[PDB]
């Protein structure tokens, strides 16, 4: 939303100071305004770094010459003998006010000039009177024409005083009164003005002090031609300078609806300065371009302050986003999911995003994906073990590793492994093949290919030699070599269907009970005194009087409705007495013995026998 | 700012210990203020801090405990001097699910190139030694491919199992395989593209698997 300034490539023609005071002004003004514009636009990187020092030297030389040319009454004129000219003094004041930033200028000289002008150079009505017109008036711009020349001079001198008002505000106290009188005089007879240049300069003079309101803005806006510039018949330089003062007035008023068209018109005009009788227009246009920069109209309005109403209500969390923090991402971490209120305040626009991360229940996702293992064992000590594989993909499988991890005290029959290694597309490492014997409980088999349409599978015998009860279930695990996270696993056990161990689980609280259901007592020892004496062991905690009431079944366990009569010996629980109780037992325990309802039973146990949640 | 992290791969739920050396253009300790931001894999800062190197002799030990629920992949630590925020120094540490391996696999081809007109094919040697200095016995799968630009295409007829005895095995990629795997029969037009060797080793125990790629 901005217009690029001039690259200043063709502004190289912008003259050593020489001649009298007027000629020295002619020399300095284009160079001074050019260096000011270059400083504002920061384009010295390409115009040439060295020339700035020469420019400063020449402008300082001219400034020193004019300081030597200053009259004892702090007056500036073409000649010291010649009467001082109000327009020349105002122009020198403007040049000094522009050059104080670049070169040192005595503020006392400016204050003395202001006092001298105020004392006798003005009428009580606020009219600025020129006591001596310049000898060379062909380069003063629109002031050469006599129509409404008094108003134009009044506005120009008023602008020159106001732009230097802050410099001599303390020294001169009558300046604000003169400024107010001049503004009142300008606004009194604004309707008589017809020239666009005079109208523009009068409007700038009125706006710099703060009385541009009401129908004046409407008249100025309707005065625009093609909504780009204020032109008058005659020289186009007057139109250029009128547009310059118009855009300065707009910038002072900060009216953004008209600046882009004006700057676009100026850019397409392609005014490079120079020529004859174009000092005022060049100075104004380059000052306009410089003032446009460092105050570029854009959309930097980011001063947001955002506050969060946390559900915990511990405190108030607020943060501010500025232009320097337009790319500042602040992350907020909350451990609780609850509605929270966000307040957005301040100029600008902001973005909010909230993301939550958690664990989701599996949607019937199985561990063994894209494989199908079916491991089987069967009695023929000999056992024929046959592992059947398949690939669930659309294509034939790559090379796969069929791993085997035998049980306790079980070893492969070394006669079959010979032809398995000898066979086609089944390779077993020589190191695993030669050792064998009782030493190996772990065999690895490499598969050249795994069929994805049929089930080609192997079968070899495994013996037993250690004869230990409570055998650990084995394992079989296949996986294509290119990854490990995608595999399968099956466990083979001679007696258990899959060797998953007994696991009595309710809902999601699993636990295992790998032990006997009860003692297979044939009532051979009818002496219950020994049993009663042995029941006092530390491994016994509670003894209860129980009577079965109702018998119920479940999926993998059976529940019985107990009726507590009395707590014989503690129990680390509420005695309760007389309320229904439930006993959870493995489904296999039904075969060992089935409890009968309406019968008295004696049972004793320990702390871990009480499983569940109260 | 030379950032040093103790490890090069972290698991979620593990603390990050790192230092931030502060030296000037002449490589001498300096007292300046630093800023550090630790970025997610996507590039959103997670932690911000400000430290001073004054009276610390140019070392600023720091810490961070990785949150349990975090994204994987490369993370980044960007640190920059407070006076010059437009120059930033960084390091990358990877968050991954891993358990430490047991042995290093080294694949060094006999020549660090492949002559296009050689009729013998690529000669690669795969060697595997345990971490603490013992030789490995196992079986190693290898594969070859052509890496052009950023697209990697593998050679289906190239994967081989070459059992390693005394921790060294050798496989060769015959030039017929290399020519037939690519769809351009012109051998000369294949120049410039780079091969890549992916070696997977599994012990005869079958308990541990390690991957090494050259």
PDB file of C-alpha atoms in Angstrom, chain B residues 11-131:
ATOM      1  CA  UNK B  11      13.761 -40.579  23.771  1.00  0.00           C
ATOM      2  CA  UNK B  12      10.584 -38.854  24.986  1.00  0.00           C
ATOM      3  CA  UNK B  13      10.601 -38.466  28.736  1.00  0.00           C
ATOM      4  CA  UNK B  14      14.374 -37.897  28.814  1.00  0.00           C
ATOM      5  CA  UNK B  15      16.104 -34.665  29.787  1.00  0.00           C
ATOM      6  CA  UNK B  16      18.192 -32.665  27.319  1.00  0.00           C
ATOM      7  CA  UNK B  17      21.521 -31.354  28.595  1.00  0.00           C
ATOM      8  CA  UNK B  18      23.330 -28.882  26.365  1.00  0.00           C
ATOM      9  CA  UNK B  19      25.839 -26.048  26.532  1.00  0.00           C
ATOM     10  CA  UNK B  20      26.174 -22.780  24.628  1.00  0.00           C
ATOM     11  CA  UNK B  21      29.713 -21.505  24.168  1.00  0.00           C
ATOM     12  CA  UNK B  22      30.018 -17.748  23.640  1.00  0.00           C
ATOM     13  CA  UNK B  23      33.111 -16.587  21.745  1.00  0.00           C
ATOM     14  CA  UNK B  24      33.912 -13.454  19.758  1.00  0.00           C
ATOM     15  CA  UNK B  25      35.380 -13.105  16.272  1.00  0.00           C
ATOM     16  CA  UNK B  26      38.902 -13.691  17.622  1.00  0.00           C
ATOM     17  CA  UNK B  27      37.866 -16.908  19.453  1.00  0.00           C
ATOM     18  CA  UNK B  28      38.039 -15.587  23.017  1.00  0.00           C
ATOM     19  CA  UNK B  29      35.460 -15.758  25.818  1.00  0.00           C
ATOM     20  CA  UNK B  30      33.062 -12.820  25.892  1.00  0.00           C
ATOM     21  CA  UNK B  31      30.314 -11.614  28.193  1.00  0.00           C
ATOM     22  CA  UNK B  32      27.101 -11.188  26.208  1.00  0.00           C
ATOM     23  CA  UNK B  33      23.407 -12.003  26.567  1.00  0.00           C
ATOM     24  CA  UNK B  34      22.006 -14.918  24.572  1.00  0.00           C
ATOM     25  CA  UNK B  35      18.520 -16.040  23.583  1.00  0.00           C
ATOM     26  CA  UNK B  36      17.539 -19.662  22.974  1.00  0.00           C
ATOM     27  CA  UNK B  37      14.432 -21.133  21.364  1.00  0.00           C
ATOM     28  CA  UNK B  38      13.831 -24.873  21.025  1.00  0.00           C
ATOM     29  CA  UNK B  39      11.718 -25.707  17.981  1.00  0.00           C
ATOM     30  CA  UNK B  40       9.326 -28.590  17.353  1.00  0.00           C
ATOM     31  CA  UNK B  41       9.725 -30.706  14.216  1.00  0.00           C
ATOM     32  CA  UNK B  42       7.288 -28.324  12.513  1.00  0.00           C
ATOM     33  CA  UNK B  43       9.132 -25.216  13.713  1.00  0.00           C
ATOM     34  CA  UNK B  44       7.117 -23.745  16.592  1.00  0.00           C
ATOM     35  CA  UNK B  45       9.145 -22.611  19.637  1.00  0.00           C
ATOM     36  CA  UNK B  46       8.486 -24.594  22.802  1.00  0.00           C
ATOM     37  CA  UNK B  47      10.894 -22.980  25.267  1.00  0.00           C
ATOM     38  CA  UNK B  48      12.332 -19.471  25.461  1.00  0.00           C
ATOM     39  CA  UNK B  49      15.080 -18.314  27.800  1.00  0.00           C
ATOM     40  CA  UNK B  50      17.545 -15.486  28.370  1.00  0.00           C
ATOM     41  CA  UNK B  51      20.993 -15.911  29.906  1.00  0.00           C
ATOM     42  CA  UNK B  52      24.104 -13.831  30.503  1.00  0.00           C
ATOM     43  CA  UNK B  53      27.624 -15.136  29.958  1.00  0.00           C
ATOM     44  CA  UNK B  54      29.041 -12.623  32.451  1.00  0.00           C
ATOM     45  CA  UNK B  55      31.384 -14.241  34.993  1.00  0.00           C
ATOM     46  CA  UNK B  56      30.651 -17.661  33.455  1.00  0.00           C
ATOM     47  CA  UNK B  57      33.832 -17.840  31.317  1.00  0.00           C
ATOM     48  CA  UNK B  58      31.824 -18.364  28.139  1.00  0.00           C
ATOM     49  CA  UNK B  59      29.950 -21.554  29.058  1.00  0.00           C
ATOM     50  CA  UNK B  60      26.199 -21.626  29.760  1.00  0.00           C
ATOM     51  CA  UNK B  61      25.068 -25.111  30.826  1.00  0.00           C
ATOM     52  CA  UNK B  62      21.323 -25.563  30.434  1.00  0.00           C
ATOM     53  CA  UNK B  63      18.624 -28.226  30.484  1.00  0.00           C
ATOM     54  CA  UNK B  64      15.229 -29.271  29.165  1.00  0.00           C
ATOM     55  CA  UNK B  65      13.012 -32.253  29.996  1.00  0.00           C
ATOM     56  CA  UNK B  66      11.314 -33.435  26.812  1.00  0.00           C
ATOM     57  CA  UNK B  67       7.520 -33.619  27.230  1.00  0.00           C
ATOM     58  CA  UNK B  68       6.011 -37.078  27.058  1.00  0.00           C
ATOM     59  CA  UNK B  69       3.551 -36.301  24.229  1.00  0.00           C
ATOM     60  CA  UNK B  70       5.778 -34.809  21.529  1.00  0.00           C
ATOM     61  CA  UNK B  71       6.238 -35.075  17.790  1.00  0.00           C
ATOM     62  CA  UNK B  72       9.102 -37.116  16.395  1.00  0.00           C
ATOM     63  CA  UNK B  73      11.760 -36.268  13.834  1.00  0.00           C
ATOM     64  CA  UNK B  74      14.477 -33.660  13.907  1.00  0.00           C
ATOM     65  CA  UNK B  75      14.249 -30.938  16.524  1.00  0.00           C
ATOM     66  CA  UNK B  76      16.237 -27.726  16.467  1.00  0.00           C
ATOM     67  CA  UNK B  77      17.872 -25.419  19.009  1.00  0.00           C
ATOM     68  CA  UNK B  78      18.412 -21.882  17.731  1.00  0.00           C
ATOM     69  CA  UNK B  79      20.514 -19.449  19.764  1.00  0.00           C
ATOM     70  CA  UNK B  80      21.447 -15.897  18.811  1.00  0.00           C
ATOM     71  CA  UNK B  81      23.133 -12.954  20.482  1.00  0.00           C
ATOM     72  CA  UNK B  82      20.725 -10.390  21.858  1.00  0.00           C
ATOM     73  CA  UNK B  83      22.323  -7.429  20.055  1.00  0.00           C
ATOM     74  CA  UNK B  84      22.272  -9.049  16.585  1.00  0.00           C
ATOM     75  CA  UNK B  85      19.015 -11.006  16.285  1.00  0.00           C
ATOM     76  CA  UNK B  86      19.335 -11.535  12.520  1.00  0.00           C
ATOM     77  CA  UNK B  87      22.251 -13.991  12.799  1.00  0.00           C
ATOM     78  CA  UNK B  88      21.227 -17.324  14.313  1.00  0.00           C
ATOM     79  CA  UNK B  89      23.199 -20.485  15.116  1.00  0.00           C
ATOM     80  CA  UNK B  90      21.628 -23.899  15.466  1.00  0.00           C
ATOM     81  CA  UNK B  91      21.989 -27.628  16.062  1.00  0.00           C
ATOM     82  CA  UNK B  92      19.709 -30.597  15.477  1.00  0.00           C
ATOM     83  CA  UNK B  93      18.890 -33.421  17.875  1.00  0.00           C
ATOM     84  CA  UNK B  94      16.540 -36.255  16.981  1.00  0.00           C
ATOM     85  CA  UNK B  95      13.701 -37.559  19.135  1.00  0.00           C
ATOM     86  CA  UNK B  96      13.011 -41.191  18.315  1.00  0.00           C
ATOM     87  CA  UNK B  97      11.787 -44.466  19.770  1.00  0.00           C
ATOM     88  CA  UNK B  98      14.916 -46.528  20.254  1.00  0.00           C
ATOM     89  CA  UNK B  99      16.735 -49.026  22.411  1.00  0.00           C
ATOM     90  CA  UNK B 100      20.508 -48.958  22.220  1.00  0.00           C
ATOM     91  CA  UNK B 101      22.014 -51.408  19.699  1.00  0.00           C
ATOM     92  CA  UNK B 102      24.800 -53.830  20.559  1.00  0.00           C
ATOM     93  CA  UNK B 103      27.242 -53.613  17.647  1.00  0.00           C
ATOM     94  CA  UNK B 104      28.392 -51.270  14.900  1.00  0.00           C
ATOM     95  CA  UNK B 105      28.137 -52.232  11.224  1.00  0.00           C
ATOM     96  CA  UNK B 106      30.607 -50.656   8.793  1.00  0.00           C
ATOM     97  CA  UNK B 107      30.234 -50.852   5.013  1.00  0.00           C
ATOM     98  CA  UNK B 108      33.225 -49.405   3.147  1.00  0.00           C
ATOM     99  CA  UNK B 109      33.470 -50.178  -0.578  1.00  0.00           C
ATOM    100  CA  UNK B 110      36.920 -51.052  -1.866  1.00  0.00           C
ATOM    101  CA  UNK B 111      37.003 -47.878  -3.972  1.00  0.00           C
ATOM    102  CA  UNK B 112      35.031 -44.773  -3.056  1.00  0.00           C
ATOM    103  CA  UNK B 113      33.467 -44.773  -6.535  1.00  0.00           C
ATOM    104  CA  UNK B 114      32.334 -47.121  -9.306  1.00  0.00           C
ATOM    105  CA  UNK B 115      33.979 -47.103 -12.717  1.00  0.00           C
ATOM    106  CA  UNK B 116      31.227 -47.152 -15.328  1.00  0.00           C
ATOM    107  CA  UNK B 117      33.114 -49.375 -17.774  1.00  0.00           C
ATOM    108  CA  UNK B 118      34.375 -51.803 -15.129  1.00  0.00           C
ATOM    109  CA  UNK B 119      33.101 -55.281 -15.958  1.00  0.00           C
ATOM    110  CA  UNK B 120      33.520 -56.603 -12.399  1.00  0.00           C
ATOM    111  CA  UNK B 121      30.831 -54.572 -10.621  1.00  0.00           C
ATOM    112  CA  UNK B 122      30.792 -52.802  -7.284  1.00  0.00           C
ATOM    113  CA  UNK B 123      32.908 -54.350  -4.521  1.00  0.00           C
ATOM    114  CA  UNK B 124      31.510 -53.671  -1.043  1.00  0.00           C
ATOM    115  CA  UNK B 125      32.801 -55.124   2.228  1.00  0.00           C
ATOM    116  CA  UNK B 126      30.466 -55.424   5.225  1.00  0.00           C
ATOM    117  CA  UNK B 127      32.131 -55.731   8.623  1.00  0.00           C
ATOM    118  CA  UNK B 128      30.506 -56.022  12.039  1.00  0.00           C
ATOM    119  CA  UNK B 129      32.195 -55.799  15.431  1.00  0.00           C
ATOM    120  CA  UNK B 130      30.609 -55.634  18.850  1.00  0.00           C
ATOM    121  CA  UNK B 131      30.651 -52.314  20.686  1.00  0.00           C
TER     122      UNK B 131
END
